[PDB]
């Protein structure tokens, strides 16, 4: 009858974390909902970085989407509400087309407790995503807690970081009034569990500079992925990518300096 | 002529003060043969808190004369942060002078601290709390109730409590939207103290200030369960059983 969108996710906490990963950088955004899945795509208010989020429908335990629809969300409101959900809660979303409210329903495992929140939506016009899939001079894959530790540490030294990678490894550098710091990461040839590995794919050495404010925001994704992947070219934007396992990915895009 | 109570589970005394300190700046402690009795309104007269510690619950209880010791709850809390959690704690007073003595002992027995706190002169102020039946009484885990007030406070500043025979709902509104939380009565002899139990003589639908409920949930460490007693036009009672030894009761009136 009415055109429904409805998604049941048993590991609700994924959705929770996803919002932690967004709320501090994006205030509001359109969710593109189709049968492919849930797709989100927005630039932060200072127009320097772009987040893009993909939750494929097969990732959801239940998924229905009668026709493509788009919902303007206040990620701040959405985050507040998701803090009301249990880490073990089963989470359902539910809206009809042209809705002014989103239903979020949180089910405890025992089925003796149930919460529901009707969240106000907004009307937002969101177009575009003229993002060509592209070839990078360097791709680097490493533990997400390590990358996060690095950004955390270099942000005591300075507020920009030079990334420089070669065949053998990648180096991160900052500098300020305290002093200079250089963190160097070499390829784990070895033989290991992917959450400790360091792997480099390379066509040509890049050496690029990025502001560490932004990087430090991207790292709020850290709970979503054991790894994180960085892709670099001359003055193409850097992309920082987290695999939300068996559901999709979360990619941040940053513009280098000069 | 002297008062002295020794409490082994001294932590209880800590949790009790952590639960009052934020609501109440000063209260009078009524001491008598039958135990300890504290009653107070909060600084703005909206709510009332009542605390009973029966003398049977102490390992040692001695009370020559009835006293009313005026205490600053915030100083007394500072002094009890200095007690370890496994500390055997003793209260001691001399009727004359107004000093209360808090003695802490390590169960190792190699360390002993005494703190002498100054007392105030306060107004002796009881309010008569009436014996009562309630239309609905909800027993639930103190943590779930605590979670519920916290979450709804992100939604609005009032919570509507709708109580049926075999479930209760907690709803809020505000600029973000609505929220509703439904607990069903539990089968039980599952578990024990994660049972939700409703006794309903008369269905209620009552509105309360989340501002105050969240002060009440500070007592959550004192008990695994909380009880809610409700009627139309009658203060809500939020009760925390302290061990085998007493209770902390909070009173808050509903809309109209």
């Amino acid at each position: 009858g009415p055109h429904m969108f409805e998604a049941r996710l048993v590991q609700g906490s994924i959705l929770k974390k996803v919002l932690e990963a967004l709320k501090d950088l994006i205030n509001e955004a359109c969710w593109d909902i189709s049968s492919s899945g849930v797709n989100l795509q927005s630039m932060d208010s200072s127009h320097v970085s772009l987040v893009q989020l993909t939750l494929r429908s097969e990732g959801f335990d239940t998924y229905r989407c009668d026709r493509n629809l788009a919902m303007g969300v206040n990620l701040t409101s959405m985050s507040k509400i998701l803090k009301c959900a249990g880490n073990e809660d089963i989470i359902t979303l539910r809206a009809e087309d042209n809705a002014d409210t989103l239903a979020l329903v949180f089910e405890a495992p025992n089925q003796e407790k149930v919460s529901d929140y009707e969240m106000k939506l907004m009307d937002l016009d969101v177009e575009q995503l003229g993002i060509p899939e592209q070839e990078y001079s360097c791709v680097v894959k490493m533990p997400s807690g390590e990358f996060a530790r690095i950004c955390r540490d270099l942000s005591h030294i300075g507020d920009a970081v030079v990334i420089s990678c070669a065949k053998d490894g990648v180096k991160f550098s900052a500098s300020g009034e305290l002093g200079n710091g250089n963190i160097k990461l070499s390829q784990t040839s070895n033989v290991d569990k992917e959450e400790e590995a360091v792997t480099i794919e390379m066509n040509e050495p890049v050496q690029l500079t990025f502001a560490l404010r932004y990087l430090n925001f991207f790292t709020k994704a850290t709970p979503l992925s054991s790894t994180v992947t960085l892709s670099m070219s001359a003055d193409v934007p850097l992309v920082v990518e987290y695999k939300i396992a068996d559901m999709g990915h979360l990619k941040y895009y940053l513009a280098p300096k000069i | 002529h002297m008062f002295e109570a020794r409490l082994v589970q001294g932590s209880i005394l800590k949790k009790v003060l952590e639960a009052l300190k934020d609501l109440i700046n000063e209260a009078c402690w009524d001491i008598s043969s039958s135990g300890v009795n504290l009653q107070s309104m909060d600084s703005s007269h909206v709510s009332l808190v009542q605390l009973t510690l029966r003398s049977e619950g102490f390992d040692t209880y001695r009370c020559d004369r009835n006293l009313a010791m005026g205490v600053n709850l915030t100083s007394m809390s500072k002094i009890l942060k200095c007690a370890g959690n496994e500390d055997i704690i003793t209260l001691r007073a001399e009727d004359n002078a107004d000093t209360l003595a808090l003695v802490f002992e390590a169960p190792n027995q190699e360390k002993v601290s005494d703190y002498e706190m100054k007392l105030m002169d306060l107004d002796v102020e009881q309010l008569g709390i009436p014996e009562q039946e309630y239309s609905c009484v909800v027993k639930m885990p103190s943590g779930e109730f605590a979670r519920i007030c916290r979450d709804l406070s992100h939604i609005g500043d009032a919570v509507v409590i709708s109580c049926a025979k075999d479930g209760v709902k907690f709803s809020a509104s505000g600029e973000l939207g609505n929220g509703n939380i439904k607990l069903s009565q539990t089968s039980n002899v599952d578990k024990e103290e994660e049972a939700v139990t409703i006794e309903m003589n008369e269905p209620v639908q009552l509105t309360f200030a989340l501002r105050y409920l969240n002060f009440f949930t500070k007592a959550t460490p004192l008990s695994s369960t909380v009880t809610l007693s409700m009627s139309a036009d009658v203060p809500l009672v939020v009760e925390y059983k302290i061990a085998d030894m007493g209770h902390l009761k909070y009173y808050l009136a509903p809309k109209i």
């Binding site: - | 703005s44 008569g128 989340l210 203060p235």
Partner: peptide, 21 residues
């Protein structure tokens, strides 16, 4: 979730209106 700061509502009657001394 830390607990929001919520103001005392308009309709709030004091407990003194229910119990006497």
């Amino acid at each position: 979730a830390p607990v929001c700061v919520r103001p005392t509502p308009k309709w709030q009657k004091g407990i003194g209106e229910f119990f006497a001394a």
